[PDB]
Amino acid sequence: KIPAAVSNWKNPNGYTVALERRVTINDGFMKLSEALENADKKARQEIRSKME
Amino acid sequence: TSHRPQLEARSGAKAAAYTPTGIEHARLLPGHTTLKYRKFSWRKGTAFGRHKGYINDMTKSEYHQEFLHKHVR
Amino acid sequence: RGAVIGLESRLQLWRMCISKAESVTRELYQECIQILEFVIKFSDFESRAREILAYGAKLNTELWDSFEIFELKDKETYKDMLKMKKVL
Amino acid sequence: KRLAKIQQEQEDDEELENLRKKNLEMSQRAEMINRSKHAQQEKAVTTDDLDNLVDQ
Amino acid sequence: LIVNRYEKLLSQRPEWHAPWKLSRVINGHLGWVRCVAIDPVDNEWFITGSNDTTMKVWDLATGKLKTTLAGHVMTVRDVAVSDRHPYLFSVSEDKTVKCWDLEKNQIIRDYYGHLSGVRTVSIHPTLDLIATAGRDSVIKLWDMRTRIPVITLVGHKGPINQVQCTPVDPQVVSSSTDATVRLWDVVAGKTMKVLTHHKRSVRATALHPKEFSVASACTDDIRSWGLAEGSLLTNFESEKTGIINTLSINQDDVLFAGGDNGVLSFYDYKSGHKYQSLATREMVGSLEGERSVLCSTFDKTGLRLITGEADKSIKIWKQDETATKESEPGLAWNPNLSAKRF
Amino acid sequence: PVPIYVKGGVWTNVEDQILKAAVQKYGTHQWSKVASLLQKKTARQSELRWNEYLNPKLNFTEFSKEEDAQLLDLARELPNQWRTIADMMARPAQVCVERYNRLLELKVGDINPNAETQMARPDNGDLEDEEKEMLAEARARLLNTQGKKATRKIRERMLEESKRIAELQKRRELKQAGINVAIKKPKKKYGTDIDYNEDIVYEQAPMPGIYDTSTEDRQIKKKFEQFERKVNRKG
Amino acid sequence: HVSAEQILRDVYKKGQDILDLEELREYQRRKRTEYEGYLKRNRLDMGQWIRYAQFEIEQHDMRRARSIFERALLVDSSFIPLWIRYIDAELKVKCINHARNLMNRAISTLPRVDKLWYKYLIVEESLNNVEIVR
Amino acid sequence: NEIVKTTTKQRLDAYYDLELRNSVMDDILEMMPESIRQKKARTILQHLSEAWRCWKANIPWDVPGMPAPIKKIIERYIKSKADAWVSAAHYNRERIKRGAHVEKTMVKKNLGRLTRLWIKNEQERQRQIQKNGPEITPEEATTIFSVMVEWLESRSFSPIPFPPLTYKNDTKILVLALEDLKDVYASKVRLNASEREELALIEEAYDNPHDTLNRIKKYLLTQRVFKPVDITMMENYQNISPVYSVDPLEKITDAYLDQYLWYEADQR
Amino acid sequence: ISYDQLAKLSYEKTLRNLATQTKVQKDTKTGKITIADDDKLVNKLAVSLQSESKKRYEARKRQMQNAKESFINDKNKQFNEKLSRESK
RNA sequence: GUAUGUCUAAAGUUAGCUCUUAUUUACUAACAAACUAG
RNA sequence: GAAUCUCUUUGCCUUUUGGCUUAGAUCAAGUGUAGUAUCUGUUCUUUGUAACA
Numbered sequence A: 001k002i003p004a005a006v007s008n009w010k011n012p013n014g015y016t017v018a019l020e021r022r023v024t025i026n027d028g029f030m031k032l033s034e035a036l037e038n039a040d041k042k043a044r045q046e047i048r049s050k051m052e
Numbered sequence B: 001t002s003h004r005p006q007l008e009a010r011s012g013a014k015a016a017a018y019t020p021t022g023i024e025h026a027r028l029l030p031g032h033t034t035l036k037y038r039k040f041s042w043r044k045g046t047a048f049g050r051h052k053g054y055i056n057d058m059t060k061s062e063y064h065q066e067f068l069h070k071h072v073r
Numbered sequence C: 001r002g003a004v005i006g007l008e009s010r011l012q013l014w015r016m017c018i019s020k021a022e023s024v025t026r027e028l029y030q031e032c033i034q035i036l037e038f039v040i041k042f043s044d045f046e047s048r049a050r051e052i053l054a055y056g057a058k059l060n061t062e063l064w065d066s067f068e069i070f071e072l073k074d075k076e077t078y079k080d081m082l083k084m085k086k087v088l
Numbered sequence D: 001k002r003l004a005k006i007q008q009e010q011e012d013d014e015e016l017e018n019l020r021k022k023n024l025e026m027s028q029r030a031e032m033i034n035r036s037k038h039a040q041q042e043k044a045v046t047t048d049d050l051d052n053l054v055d056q
Numbered sequence E: 001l002i003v004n005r006y007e008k009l010l011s012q013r014p015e016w017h018a019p020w021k022l023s024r025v026i027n028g029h030l031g032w033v034r035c036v037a038i039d040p041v042d043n044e045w046f047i048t049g050s051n052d053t054t055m056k057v058w059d060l061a062t063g064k065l066k067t068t069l070a071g072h073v074m075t076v077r078d079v080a081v082s083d084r085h086p087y088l089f090s091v092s093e094d095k096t097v098k099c100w101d102l103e104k105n106q107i108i109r110d111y112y113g114h115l116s117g118v119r120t121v122s123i124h125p126t127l128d129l130i131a132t133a134g135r136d137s138v139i140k141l142w143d144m145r146t147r148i149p150v151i152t153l154v155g156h157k158g159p160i161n162q163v164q165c166t167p168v169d170p171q172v173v174s175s176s177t178d179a180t181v182r183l184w185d186v187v188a189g190k191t192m193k194v195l196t197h198h199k200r201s202v203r204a205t206a207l208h209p210k211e212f213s214v215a216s217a218c219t220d221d222i223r224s225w226g227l228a229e230g231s232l233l234t235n236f237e238s239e240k241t242g243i244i245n246t247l248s249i250n251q252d253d254v255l256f257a258g259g260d261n262g263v264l265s266f267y268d269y270k271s272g273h274k275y276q277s278l279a280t281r282e283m284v285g286s287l288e289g290e291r292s293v294l295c296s297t298f299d300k301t302g303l304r305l306i307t308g309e310a311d312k313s314i315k316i317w318k319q320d321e322t323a324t325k326e327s328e329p330g331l332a333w334n335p336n337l338s339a340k341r342f
Numbered sequence F: 001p002v003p004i005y006v007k008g009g010v011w012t013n014v015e016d017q018i019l020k021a022a023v024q025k026y027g028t029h030q031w032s033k034v035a036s037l038l039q040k041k042t043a044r045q046s047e048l049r050w051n052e053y054l055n056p057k058l059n060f061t062e063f064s065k066e067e068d069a070q071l072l073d074l075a076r077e078l079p080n081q082w083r084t085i086a087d088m089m090a091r092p093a094q095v096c097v098e099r100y101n102r103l104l105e106l107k108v109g110d111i112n113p114n115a116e117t118q119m120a121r122p123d124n125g126d127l128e129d130e131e132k133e134m135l136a137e138a139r140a141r142l143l144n145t146q147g148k149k150a151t152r153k154i155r156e157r158m159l160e161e162s163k164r165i166a167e168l169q170k171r172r173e174l175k176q177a178g179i180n181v182a183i184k185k186p187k188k189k190y191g192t193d194i195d196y197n198e199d200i201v202y203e204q205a206p207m208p209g210i211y212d213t214s215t216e217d218r219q220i221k222k223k224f225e226q227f228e229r230k231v232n233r234k235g
Numbered sequence G: 001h002v003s004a005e006q007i008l009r010d011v012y013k014k015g016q017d018i019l020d021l022e023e024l025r026e027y028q029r030r031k032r033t034e035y036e037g038y039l040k041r042n043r044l045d046m047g048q049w050i051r052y053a054q055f056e057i058e059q060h061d062m063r064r065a066r067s068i069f070e071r072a073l074l075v076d077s078s079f080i081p082l083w084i085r086y087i088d089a090e091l092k093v094k095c096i097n098h099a100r101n102l103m104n105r106a107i108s109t110l111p112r113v114d115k116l117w118y119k120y121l122i123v124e125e126s127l128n129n130v131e132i133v134r
Numbered sequence H: 001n002e003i004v005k006t007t008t009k010q011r012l013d014a015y016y017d018l019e020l021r022n023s024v025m026d027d028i029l030e031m032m033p034e035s036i037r038q039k040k041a042r043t044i045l046q047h048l049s050e051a052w053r054c055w056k057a058n059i060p061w062d063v064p065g066m067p068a069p070i071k072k073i074i075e076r077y078i079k080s081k082a083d084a085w086v087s088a089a090h091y092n093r094e095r096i097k098r099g100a101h102v103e104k105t106m107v108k109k110n111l112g113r114l115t116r117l118w119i120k121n122e123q124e125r126q127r128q129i130q131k132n133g134p135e136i137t138p139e140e141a142t143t144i145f146s147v148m149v150e151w152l153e154s155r156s157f158s159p160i161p162f163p164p165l166t167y168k169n170d171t172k173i174l175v176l177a178l179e180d181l182k183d184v185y186a187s188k189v190r191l192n193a194s195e196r197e198e199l200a201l202i203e204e205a206y207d208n209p210h211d212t213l214n215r216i217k218k219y220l221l222t223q224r225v226f227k228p229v230d231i232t233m234m235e236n237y238q239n240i241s242p243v244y245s246v247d248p249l250e251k252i253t254d255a256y257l258d259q260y261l262w263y264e265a266d267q268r
Numbered sequence I: 001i002s003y004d005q006l007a008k009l010s011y012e013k014t015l016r017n018l019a020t021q022t023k024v025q026k027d028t029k030t031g032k033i034t035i036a037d038d039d040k041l042v043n044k045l046a047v048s049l050q051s052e053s054k055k056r057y058e059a060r061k062r063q064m065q066n067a068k069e070s071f072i073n074d075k076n077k078q079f080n081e082k083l084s085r086e087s088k
Numbered sequence J: 001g002u003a004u005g006u007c008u009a010a011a012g013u014u015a016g017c018u019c020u021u022a023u024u025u026a027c028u029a030a031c032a033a034a035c036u037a038g
Numbered sequence K: 001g002a003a004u005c006u007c008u009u010u011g012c013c014u015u016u017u018g019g020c021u022u023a024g025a026u027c028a029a030g031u032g033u034a035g036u037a038u039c040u041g042u043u044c045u046u047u048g049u050a051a052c053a
């Protein structure tokens, strides 16, 4: 029971139609951003140790 | 709706029923008139260094990526 | 089987199944729920419990009661109440 | 006069109108009213949970 | 009387054939191979016309390229290498039938006159004419000297898929999408015998090389025809096989049948028995729809089998010379009564 | 005046509904003809109004505890990638920005950066004359189904029927008059033009069968001649 | 109250004799030029063959309508409603010998189609020719 | 009267369409059971063409209720059309770069084919590092950040501040960022909607500098979701080049931020 | 069901319609078969086929009459009815 | 402004509502302040 | 007990989307006169009886 061929780009006979007929992650980002936060903490621990 | 897809082809029965006109074409001039027959220390300051096939899809291929990195700069 | 493959009659079958479970039981209950209030009953029996309650809510007067019971058995309770309200 | 008509019919569109700012602030006020309702209901839920936990 | 026919089938037994397994994959083309042709004398090479317009001449013993024949501009649909001429007739859908002089590897003759795209060639093996037919539902015979459409063949309704020529009348055994395998009289220009036993488009007719018969293939029914009168010889088993693209007939009565579903089905041609059903593995990055076996041929000896599939590959299949009648007996011989195909 | 220079106006309800009645007819990619309806807006802003407010497939509803606790983890993970967080949530980007800003906790003449996401101003019966004109032109253009070649063919076939009934009107006057003049035949456009009254249009009488024929051809010819006399007297 | 159903409902709402024989001859000329024009460009719309042949049934000339159904069978003989309507066409004009030639053709063409057989069996049922049905 | 037209270079597209379309319709009519074609034979192929546009837009061709083998055969035939289309794009590209006779319309067609292929490779290249990866390991990222902290503290680099409400050189940075924008629009005549709209934004910024600076600093604070970027892919006959047509409201504050970041990087 | 079964059921329906209602010569040379067909049976079949055609005609007009989601002209509401029937 | 399309008796075929009236807006014009077409 | 008429549901689609490419491509910078179309403003209305042919 093939559907009745509604598409977005070409409406040939100018039909309007029901609107619905027209129209997760790897872990590695958690591996990056956490590590970057860790490095940022080390940076803030190092530089503030030198600002005393 | 003046432009349409093809339903069936123009059949050669309709071309076999027409009587021909003799229009000696530029390519049906006699040529190749013989049929051939067969027989029968300085790098330790940095942070990186040595001290420290085929797939069927054409768009996803290796050559196409080499192509697009060659021709979009 | 009866509960599954079988309105009054169906209800009776369900009841029988429940009884059997009470007397594997959990599995039976789950099956009953799938087949079909039933969800609420299952939740009550259980009383994971929270999850069951939530499920019951999704598939409401008795639901609220069930939620309350779950809460009893504070923040969580409040959240549940809020959810119920939203649903309503 | 031409530039004044331009600065009228342009800047009626690409400015937040006082009625448009009123409607947007009314929608934000209804959102804050629903948030205040949920916050007061959460406070009543916490007080009711404490009362019924010490009561039941 | 039907019970007598079924009992007389179950009385007889099929012939054993050696099981086919794959031996060589050729992955050269930038498009789908649409027909495969092999030289009927030398077996030094076979040419596979493909959708990237470039016919490629591959090598049987080594699997190498040797040349590429790229005179067309459209999809090369059929390739037919001559038996007694050093020619190579290449139907494409350029509306052009081009002759390739194999002593030169050049286009020499261009047969104009087709009304639409052409699908198949059929070199009449004991005369100097070729049989080209296609979408325009009419077979044009072509004298190879004068490039004239000599005899038009009127009577097919839809586009014509596969045309085969025999040295004795029916000299054109053609078949179209109107489910008719027409047997043609080349002299009279009339269909001597119209064979209407198929249901859908007969995409495949293959000549038996050692007996005067033609196998024709619709979806889930492949049927062998005796060309002496136009009689059905055997309705093959072919249950739930799929859309059959091409057939090919061994000298040793092994009938290939490539399906669009990726399945192969080698048939005992005498008995109609299905004995082996392969699953053509797709390439490592193909879609599942590209398992289809578009075209095939045998070796002149028949011990090889060449298939062009739609995954831009060419596969070679050979028999198991180490299997016996008791080792790999093939599928079972049991004719089905629910089908009337027996 | 028509200053149509800047177009970023605040989305009213009537433009919102005309875009909803436009994407149904035209579609998700044909936006110049959607912006032809809306006399105030662009095609980029219409496409943004679509993909951020008027597309029903992405969710505007309130988020669960799970979605808040994973959106905080995403905004730590993917820091300022709000279109990426929008793709992961399958949710509008500015809505997820507003939800993140609510989880952590613009004057009149200022040009609104982000008007095409928030809301739509309701029009409680106060349809402006600009709104009446633009809405009437929009419902004029949504009726434009046939092309102008089909429109001129309906026009030409109407002219054929009008000329034909005028010709029959003139002939009926001259026939009540008594002047016996027959109808024109249409001109042979091409030299082998077929006139479909003289002969059978293509004689394709059925192939002869085993039953005898003429006894009902006589009935056919008799009934046809009685119909000819009846058209001669009634029509 | 400017919702899209109102706009589309109102754009739906916005979108909406023979005296003498020679006049009927001009009517047939106009109408046959029309239908042969829309059958010359497309010879595969079988409903068009059906309704032009049914038009020429309404014009009561039967050799024309028989020629039109036979050319329609020449195009696609496998289309069963074409057969059934041409059979019922020659039966409405009370011509059963023509219809028996027709349905013998419809049987010898398509034997493995049930409805041609069953309709011929119906015609021989209500004609009460039992030995024929045998 | 039987003049039949051979397929020259005007009819590769149209006759290849008729070729592939007849092939696909014969495949469906072979596959489908007992259906006599009157109207449906015309319409299934629309799905085919829908799928081809779904292949050109790289949208997943998901149609609800389509059978499995019909979806399979439409996917493999649009992959065949894709293979011929991509190989024709390569053949046209190395036909232009050889310097031979290439049609103007074939150059514009080759622009369109190569930008569809470029955005398709771009979407796949975003989508892989969406699905797996990303390619940078955490240890690489920490060493990058560590050597940047080490450099920026070895140079005693004070960070660039946010531009204040009363920044000293502010209107000069603004008139530089707007002379950067009017340098495009001093000589040209043909102006579309977006160019005319942003030229009106520059003229309105000249009419009000202080409202413009407050608009820009408000957008630098609060706005984190931005209007999209059109690309247009202008042609250089060795290599196409991406041309990012950014939104008209965005380029004023981005040119301001470019001027401010370069001036505050060169001061520090 | 299918065209074979539907032809079978229409044959059974037409035999039910007859149930509610209820020689052969040849020449020598031509060989054409003259069958005696009674005029009451001939025009009874004719009136029956015209009554079936008019009954189907009026029932099809009854289906044409009904109009009750989003459409511009008549063909469009038919196509939207088709999409509503595809949605199951 | 082209393409292109269409019309053109000299010749005789035998018996709430209905309304007037003005402002505004939208699309069009080789109409105006020697030349421009697919 | 035999059957007709009217409804309800199901099944058949019944005026039921009939190609392609670079989404095929690009989008007012006036006025006056006129034409067409629409809104808004304005005024009016609610038979017996007798004789003769």
Ligand SMILES: [Mg+2]
Pocket (backbone or CB within 6 Å): J038
């Ligand atoms: Mg032109």
